Design a protein around this ligand. Structure first.
Ligand SMILES: CC1(NS(=O)(=O)c2cnc3[nH]c(=O)[nH]c(=O)c3c2)CC1
Length: 167
């Protein structure tokens, strides 16, 4: 038993809710919250900008030190940093950005990072401003992640379409 509430159960291991990931994180304080990161960990907008704003920019300060030491992530890659006031840890995962021409096949590699963590609160990778079809992203998630994932979907309209079209 864990503290996630109100989720619809899609599969053995995937759950979905219409929620603001920032507010969900604030209340659950999960072990891991996933950020929809870019390779530079520049958290300017989308999920990343919202998470970072909720940390009062501490996420960005930590991220800038990480990049200065290690250089950029790979598309499809990830790193574990602090969860600040939102979670114990933040798993920064880089899904492909269709609006930059990145290969959508890398979405599966991005979701594979989730398998290193037993339980996660996460957004749909490559959705929103990253330009992928969220229905495709949900399918890849279900077919790739084997650990327990609680998906927060900000847009209520989108949430209903994802549920109603789920096979
Ligand atoms: C498919 C969807 N877009 S998104 O990329 O996942 C996203 C973008 N910005 C967000 N800002 C925020 O404050 N809370 C969020 O949950 C959030 C989620 C509708 C979820």
């Amino acid at each position: 038993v864990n503290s996630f509430s109100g989720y619809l159960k899609l599969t053995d291991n995937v759950y979905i809710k219409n929620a603001d990931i920032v507010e969900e994180a604030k209340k659950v304080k999960p072990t891991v919250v996933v950020n929809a990161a870019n390779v530079y960990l520049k958290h300017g907008g989308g999920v990343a900008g919202a998470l970072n704003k909720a940390t009062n920019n501490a996420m960005q300060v930590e991220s800038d030190d990480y990049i200065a030491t290690n250089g950029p992530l790979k598309v499809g890659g990830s790193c574990v940093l602090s969860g600040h006031n939102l979670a114990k840890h933040c798993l920064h995962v880089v899904g492909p950005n269709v609006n930059k021409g990145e290969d959508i096949q890398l979405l599966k590699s991005a979701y594979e990072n989730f398998n290193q963590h037993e339980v996660l609160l996460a957004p749909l990778l490559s959705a929103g401003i990253f330009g992928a079809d969220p229905i495709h992203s949900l399918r890849v998630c279900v077919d790739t992640v084997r650990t327990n994932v609680y998906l927060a979907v900000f847009d209520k309209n989108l949430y209903d379409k994802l549920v109603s079209s789920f096979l």
